[PDB]
Design a protein around this ligand. Structure first.
Ligand SMILES: CC(=O)N[C@@H]1[C@@H](O)[C@H](O)[C@@H](CO)O[C@H]1O
Ligand SMILES: CC(=O)N[C@@H]1[C@@H](O)[C@H](O)[C@@H](CO)O[C@H]1O
Ligand SMILES: [Ca+2]
Ligand SMILES: [Ca+2]
Ligand SMILES: [Ca+2]
Ligand SMILES: [Ca+2]
Ligand SMILES: [Ca+2]
Ligand SMILES: [Ca+2]
Lengths: 397, 275, 275, 263, 132, 132
C-alpha cells in the first residue's frame, strides 16, 4: 500500500522531469530512484483482474536501466524512457481498479487483491519514496494511532430527509401546528408553522425546536445562518402521514423570534449563539440543536389584522423558519464533498464492469444509504478504497 | 393511549392510496331535509321510491339514503336533531326571516358544548367570545338586567321586571350576545323555554346547507368585522323543485367531497367529548 | 388521532407534579339528583341557597352547583339525561323495586352503542355477551319467540301473538338478554315504547350512585357470576334528610376523588346513536 | 390562434410592445344593448346622435358604434344573436326573475356546441357533466321520465304522458340538468319550442353583462358548490338611465380591457 | 450518442454520472385521489381556475471532469484574459465574441475557438505564477 | 449490524453468544384455554380487572471478551482512578464526567473518551503492582 503510492509518485515525476533538452543535474536524483524501481521489479510476475467483467491480464517485467552519462537530455534519451513508463503506468491502473472493486468484512483495512498482497513483502519495500499527499499522510498517521484530519468543502454529512411533524391535528386538517424540514447534503432548512397564530397560546408565543444528530464529529466548522426557509414559503398540498388524504398549507411569513443555536458534544454545550445571523464558527460538535419561537405581533395595521381572526376559518397560516449551511469543516473519517471526485471514481469503476453486490457496501454505492448506517466496518473499507482512488488520480485522470 | 395527544411524524415521499370515494358510498348513510311544501308541488307518493333508484346509479345502496321533512324554518329550529352520517338540508329563502335563518346555521354548522342554567338562584356572565346563550323552546322571551360591582342594576331595578332590557320575544331559537364580563340577571319565561349557556368548540363537519333562492345572506360569526363564507354553504336559484332534486342527485360526489365525517363520532375522540 | 397507536415512554424516579384539586373545582361543575320526597320534609324556600353557600367552603364557586329533581326511579328512567360535569344520584331503597334500581345503575354507570330497530319487518339475534336489547318509553310489553334454522317457531307460532311469551310487563326501562345463536320475532307495543339494540362499552366516569338506606342489590352485569362492587356504588343510612345532604357537602373531597371527569360526552343522553 | 397541438416556445426578457389599444379602437365595432323603457325616460329622438359624438372623443371612429334594443329579459332570450366585435348588455334587475337572469348569462357568456334532438323517435341520455339541454321558443313545457335497463319507466308510465315529471312550464329559455347515465323519454311542446343537445366549452369573451339594480344573483355553473364571479360579471346602482350611459361612455378603457375579440 | 448510460428512478440527493453529453428529465403530475375539504375547493370541474398546479425539479452539477477548457467557480483564468483586453482597449478580432461574452462563446463553441481558448488560458496560467 | 448471529427458541439455562452488539428479546402472553374454578374467577369478561397478568424474563451476562476497556466486578481499576481524583480535590476537566460517573460515561462513550480511559486504566494497573 505504501509501495503502491511510491510507484505512482515516481512515474508522475518521470513524465514531468524527464523532458527534452533539460539539464542532467535537474534529474540526477530521480534517475537513481527510477533505476532502483526497475532492479526490484525485474524477474517478478503478477496477475490482475478476474471479478465481474474486469479482464484477466498477466504482467511480466524485464527492462534495462537508464543511462547516467549525458549533460543535456536528448530525444534518444526521452523516447527510450517513454516506452518503459507506458508499461508501468498501465500496470498501476489495473492494480488500482482491482483494489477499488473488492471488499471484506472482517478486516477491510488489509489489502484484498492478489497483486497488492504480493507487493506487501519486505522485498518490495526499497521502492518506498516520499509520502506527501493528503491521503497517504493520513494513512500513515492513523496506522500508528495518531490524530488525523481531512479538510472538506461542503461535506456530505447529512443524509437526504424531507418530512414533517404535526403537534396538533384533526381529520379536517384546518388547525395545525408543527415543523417541516429538509436535510440534504450540508444544508438544513427547518420551518415551524401555526395556523391560529398564537391567539390562545400563553403570552401569545409558540415555541419550536428541531434537533439534528450527526454521524461523525466535526471540528472547526464555518457555518452560515440566515433567518428564512425559502423552500417552505409557497402554497402547496401535502399528503397525510400514512398516505391516506392530502392537506393544504398556505403560508405567510413572520420573522423568527428569540433564535438560539446550540452545538453539543456528548450532551455538553460547546457553543451557543443568540439572535446572531451571518457567519458563525463551531469548534467541536456532533449535534446541532435549533430553537426558535413565533410571537404574535401586538400592533397591526388594518391590512394585517384581517389576516388573523379569532374564529375558526384561518385562510392565511403563520410560518417561521431558519436556514443553516456548513461551508467547510474538518472531520477525522473520510466523507464526500463538493470539491474532489473520489466518490465518483469508485462508483464509475463498479458500474462499468458490472460488479455484483458484496457484503459491505450498499447496492449501487448509494451515499444516502451509506451515511445512514455508517458502521466501523464500512469506515475501514471506505478509507481503503478512497486512498487507492487517490493514487490512480495522479497517473490517469 | 386514548387521551394523551402524542405527535405524529410522516414523510413527504409516501405514495398516494387509491380512490376511496366509491367505498364511502357503500358503508355510509345519507339524510335529506326538505320543507313539507316540496311534496305538495311534486304530486307523487313514489318519488321516495323513484329517487332511490337514481341514487343507486351514483353508487349508493337501496337502504342507505333516508328522507326527512319539516314544516318551516321556525318549527325545524325547535330541536334540530341530525342523526345520520352525512346530512344535507336545503332551506327556502325569506326576506323577512333574515336573522332566523342565520341563527339556524350557527347551531348546525358548528358544534356547541353546553352547561345548564338556573335563573332563580344565580347571576350569570359571559367569560370570552365563545360563550353565547342558546335558548330554544315553544316561546322564548328573554329579559336582561345588568349589574354593577355592588349588585345594583344599571338602568334596571332588580325587583321590578318591567324596567328590564329586552332582547327577544316569542321565538323558537335565540342566540344572545351580551357584554363579556358583567354579571347579569335574567327573566326568561321558562314555562315554554329552556336556556343553557354554550361555548363554541369548532365546526360540525358532516352537515351542509343549501340555500334555495334569494340573495347571499349568512352570518355565522356574531361579530361585525367578520362574516365568513365556508365551503359547506351553497345557494341555488329555483323555478321548480324537480330540477332542484335532479341537481343534488347528479352532484353527490361534490357535496360529499366538501364535508368530512364528524370528528366526535370516531373512536379516536374517546375522552374528548365524544359524539 | 395519529398519536393513538404510538407508544408513550415514561420513567420512574421523576418528581411529582403538585395538586390539581383546586383547579378542578374552579372551572368544572357539579349537579346532584334527588327525589321529590327529599324537599317535602325539608319544605324550605331557600334551602338551595343554604347548600350553595356550604359548597363554597369546599372550593366550588357559586355558579357551578345545580340541583335537579325526579318523582321516583320509574319516572326518572323516561329519558336518563346527564347534564353537568360530575353527577351524583340519590336513590332511596325500596324492597320491592329491586330490579328497577339495578336497571337504572346499569344504564348510567356504563356506555352504550344504540342502533335502531324495526320489529314488524325483520328478525333479530344477539351477537355476543355485549349485545343487549334496551327498550324505554311510557309502558311496553315485550313478547319474543325463539325461532329455528328454517324460520319455524320453537314452542310458539309465528302468526299468533298469544303463543309468544313475555319477558316484561309495563316497565319504564327494560334490558332484555336472550340466548345467543338463534333469531327472534318480537312483539312490542311500539306506540308507547322504542326498543333498540345496544352494545356495552367501557364504564362512564361522570357519575356515582348513593343508596339511601337498605343493603346492596347490584348485579349491574348480566352474568350471575360477577356481581361486582366498584367504588361508585355507595350506600348510607338515614332517618332525616338533612343529615343526608350534610354528609354529601362535607365529604365532597372523598367523592370527587373517585369520580374522575373528562369521560363527559358532547350530548346529555345516556347512549350513543348511530344510524 | 389557439392550439392544443403545435407548441409555441417564446422567451423571456423580450421588450414589451407599444400600447396597441388605439389601433384596437380604429379597427373594431361596439354594440350596446338596452331595454326599451330606457329610451322612454330619455325621450329624445336624436340620443343616438349625441352619444356617437362622445365615443369619438375616446378614439372610436365615426362608423363603429351601434345601438340595439330589446323588450325585456323574457323576450331578449328567445334568440340572442350577438355578432359585433365587442358586446355589452344592460340587464335591469327584477326580483322575481332571479332564475331567468342566471339562465340568460349562462347562454350569453359561454360557448355551446349544439346538436339536434328528435323527441318522437329517439331516447336521450346525458353523458358528460358538461352536457345540458337548451330549449328555446315561445312556450316550452318539458316533461321527463327516467328509465331502467329493461326499457321501462321508473316513476312514470311510458305510454301515459300525464304521469310524467315536468321541469318547465311555458318558458322562453330553459336549461335542464338531469342525472347522467340514465336514458330518458321526453315529451315537449314541439310546436312552439325547440329543444337541443348542447355542450359547454370555454367562455365567450366578446360579451359582457352589466347588471343594473339589486344584488349579485349569478350561478352560471350547474353544481351547487361553485358560484364564481368572473372578470366581466359586473354591476352598478342607478337612479337615472341618462346617468348610466355617461359611465359607459367615460370608462371604455376598462370595459374593453376585461374582454377579448372574436378572432 | 443516444445510448442510456445511467438512469435513476425516484432517487433524490447525490447521484453520479460517469459519461454523458445529454440530460433528459422526465416527471409527471398526478391529481390526488383523496382530498380534505380545504384542498377540494382549489380544484373545481368548471372553467375558473384560480389556483394553478405546478410540479418542478432542480439539478446541480457540483464537480466534473471535462477534456476541453471551460470556466468554473474556483479559478480565475477567464477573469485574467478579459481584464487585459478591457484595459488596453483591444479591437474585436475574427474569432472571439465582442467583450469575451461567455454566453456567446459556449453557445457556438467551434473547434476553431477551442484551440484559441486553450492557448490563451495556458498563457494566463503561466502569468499567474509570477504576477497575481 | 442487523444480521442474526445466534438465536435460541424456548431454551433456558446457560447459552453462548459468539459475536453481537444488540440483544433482541421476544416473548408473548397466551390466555390459558382450560381453567379450574379457582383460576376462572381472576379473569372476567367485564371491565373491573383486579388481578393483572404478567409475563417476564431475566438475562445475565456472566463473562465476556470485549476490545475496549470497561468496568467489571473482579478488578478495581475504576476504584483506583476515582479515589485519586476525590482525595486531591481535582477540578472537572473537558473530557470525563463530573465525579467520574460510570452511568454518564458509558452512555456517551465517545472515541475521545475511550483513548483517555485506556491511558488511565493502564497507569492504574502499573501502580497496583507496587502500592496496593
Ligand atoms: C390505480 C392502481 O394501479 N392501484 C391499484 C388499483 O388499480 C386497484 O384497483 C386497487 C384495488 O384495491 O388497488 C390499487 O393499489
Ligand atoms: C406612441 C408611443 O407610445 N410611442 C411609441 C414609441 O415608444 C416607440 O419607440 C415607437 C416605435 O415602436 O412607436 C411609438 O408609437
Ligand atoms: Ca330601563
Ligand atoms: Ca359576549
Ligand atoms: Ca309458547
Ligand atoms: Ca345474550
Ligand atoms: Ca310519476
Ligand atoms: Ca347532468
Amino acid at each position: 500500500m505504501d509501495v503502491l503510492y511510491s510507484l505512482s509518485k515516481t512515474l508522475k515525476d518521470a513524465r514531468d522531469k524527464i523532458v527534452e533538452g533539460t539539464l542532467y543535474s535537474n534529474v540526477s536524483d530521480l534517475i537513481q530512484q527510477f533505476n532502483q524501481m526497475i532492479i526490484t521489479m525485474n524477474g517478478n510476475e503478477f496477475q490482475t483482474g478476474g471479478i465481474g467483467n474486469l479482464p484477466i491480464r498477466n504482467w511480466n517485467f524485464n527492462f534495462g536501466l537508464l543511462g547516467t552519462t549525458l549533460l543535456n537530455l536528448d530525444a534518444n534519451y526521452v523516447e527510450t524512457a517513454r516506452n518503459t513508463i507506458d508499461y508501468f503506468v498501465d500496470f498501476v491502473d489495473n492494480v488500482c481498479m482491482d483494489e477499488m472493486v473488492r471488499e471484506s468484512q472482517r478486516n477491510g483495512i488489509a489489502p484484498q487483491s492478489d497483486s497488492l498482497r504480493k507487493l506487501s513483502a519486505i522485498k518490495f519495500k526499497r521502492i518506498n519514496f516520499d509520502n506527501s499527499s493528503e491521503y497517504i499522510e493520513n494513512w500513515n498517521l492513523q496506522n500508528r494511532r495518531q490524530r488525523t484530519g481531512f479538510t472538506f468543502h461542503k461535506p456530505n454529512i447529512f443524509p437526504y430527509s424531507a418530512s414533517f411533524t404535526l403537534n396538533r391535528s384533526q381529520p379536517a386538517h384546518d388547525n395545525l401546528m408543527g415543523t417541516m424540514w429538509l436535510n440534504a447534503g450540508s444544508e438544513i432548512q427547518v420551518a415551524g408553522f401555526d395556523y391560529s397564530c398564537a391567539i390562545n397560546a400563553p403570552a401569545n408565543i409558540q415555541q419550536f425546536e428541531h434537533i439534528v444528530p450527526l454521524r461523525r464529529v466535526l471540528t472547526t466548522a464555518t457555518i452560515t445562518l440566515l433567518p428564512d426557509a425559502e423552500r417552505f414559503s409557497f402554497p402547496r398540498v401535502i399528503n397525510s402521514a400514512d398516505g391516506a388524504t392530502t392537506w393544504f398549507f398556505n403560508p405567510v411569513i413572520l420573522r423568527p423570534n428569540n433564535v438560539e443555536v446550540e452545538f453539543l458534544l456528548n450532551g455538553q454545550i460547546i457553543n451557543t449563539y443568540q439572535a446572531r445571523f451571518g457567519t458563525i464558527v463551531a469548534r467541536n460538535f456532533d449535534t446541532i440543536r435549533l430553537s426558535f419561537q413565533l410571537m404574535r405581533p401586538p400592533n397591526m395595521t388594518p391590512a394585517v389584522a384581517v389576516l388573523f381572526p379569532n374564529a375558526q376559518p384561518f385562510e392565511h397560516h403563520a410560518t417561521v423558519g431558519l436556514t443553516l449551511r456548513i461551508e467547510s469543516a474538518v472531520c477525522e473519517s473520510v466523507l464526500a464533498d463538493a470539491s474532489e471526485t473520489l466518490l465518483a471514481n469508485v462508483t464509475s469503476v463498479r458500474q462499468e464492469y458490472a460488479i455484483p453486490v458484496g457484503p459491505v457496501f450498499p447496492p449501487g454505492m448509494n451515499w444516502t444509504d451509506l451515511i445512514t448506517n455508517y458502521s466501523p466496518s464500512r469506515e475501514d473499507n471506505l478509507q481503503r478504497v478512497f486512498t487507492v482512488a487517490s493514487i490512480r488520480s495522479m497517473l490517469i485522470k | 393511549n386514548y387521551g394523551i395527544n402524542l405527535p405524529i411524524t410522516g414523510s413527504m415521499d409516501t405514495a398516494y392510496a387509491n380512490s376511496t370515494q366509491e367505498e364511502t358510498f357503500l358503508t355510509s348513510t345519507l339524510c335529506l331535509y326538505y320543507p313539507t311544501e316540496a311534496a305538495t308541488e311534486i304530486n307523487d307518493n313514489s318519488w321516495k321510491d323513484t329517487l332511490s333508484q337514481l341514487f343507486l346509479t351514483k353508487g349508493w345502496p337501496t337502504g342507505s339514503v333516508y328522507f326527512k321533512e319539516y314544516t318551516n324554518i321556525a318549527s325545524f329550529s325547535v330541536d334540530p336533531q341530525l342523526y345520520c352520517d352525512y346530512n344535507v338540508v336545503l332551506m327556502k329563502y325569506d326576506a323577512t326571516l333574515q336573522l332566523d335563518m342565520s341563527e339556524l346555521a350557527d347551531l348546525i354548522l358548528n358544534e356547541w358544548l353546553c352547561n345548564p342554567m338556573d335563573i332563580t338562584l344565580y347571576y350569570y356572565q359571559q367569560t370570552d367570545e365563545a360563550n353565547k346563550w342558546i335558548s330554544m323552546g315553544s316561546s322564548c322571551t328573554i329579559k336582561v338586567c345588568p349589574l354593577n360591582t355592588q349588585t345594583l342594576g344599571i338602568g334596571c331595578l332588580t325587583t321590578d321586571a318591567t324596567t328590564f332590557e329586552e332582547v327577544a320575544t316569542a321565538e323558537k331559537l335565540v342566540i344572545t350576545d351580551v357584554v363579556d364580563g358583567v354579571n347579569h340577571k335574567l327573566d326568561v319565561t321558562t314555562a315554554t323555554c329552556t336556556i343553557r349557556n354554550c361555548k363554541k368548540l369548532g365546526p360540525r363537519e358532516n352537515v351542509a346547507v343549501i340555500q334555495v333562492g334569494g340573495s347571499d345572506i349568512l352570518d355565522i360569526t356574531a361579530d361585525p368585522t367578520t362574516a365568513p363564507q365556508t365551503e359547506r354553504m351553497m345557494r341555488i336559484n329555483w323555478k321548480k323543485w324537480w330540477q332542484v332534486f335532479y341537481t343534488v342527485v347528479d352532484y353527490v360526489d361534490q357535496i360529499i367531497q366538501v364535508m368530512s365525517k364528524r370528528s366526535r363520532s370516531l373512536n379516536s375522540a374517546a375522552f374528548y367529548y365524544r359524539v
